[PDB]
Design a protein that fits this description.
The complex is a heterodimer of chains A (126) and B (40). Chain A is built from 1 helix and 9 strands, in the order βαββββββββ. Chain A is mostly beta strands and 126 residues long. Chain A has one domain. Classes of the chains: A mainly beta (126), B alpha+beta (40). Chain B: It is found in: Host cytoplasmic vesicle membrane.
Chain lengths: 126, 40
Amino acid sequence: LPVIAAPSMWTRPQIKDFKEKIQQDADSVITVGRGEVVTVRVPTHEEGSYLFWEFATDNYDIGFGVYFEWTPLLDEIVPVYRRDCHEEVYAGSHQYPGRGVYLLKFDNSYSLWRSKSVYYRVYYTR
Amino acid sequence: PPPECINDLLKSVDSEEIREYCKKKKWIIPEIPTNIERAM
């Protein structure tokens, strides 16, 4: 079967620059309600190698994970876990296993009282 | 511009500057998501 390459993840200290840049270019800021899971679907491009993602939050942590949907099978790429992306920007990358759709899950399920503001950015290489 | 090397860069040195430059050279192409789903 297809062997799935391991994702890469890291962080960069400048949070304020990221959120500043996001608001400028477009308005895409996901507001995740209380007990909600937002899933951003990001398909693979016919000629493309990797998907790069970035995300950050304002006042609070949030759950993040990455799944891959084939061409409904699901591979788990980054298992869903809580990140402190309010302190720093969180980034990562993964190589295409094949033709399919990436599911970026922003998981607030645990939080009873608190909505989360999510700034995110996505890229791909060729 | 090999994909694997673009990754080692951004890991080690990451900023808006590197991102915009990598956008300039079309090493990284801005992505457009399709659907954004909401569940409880």
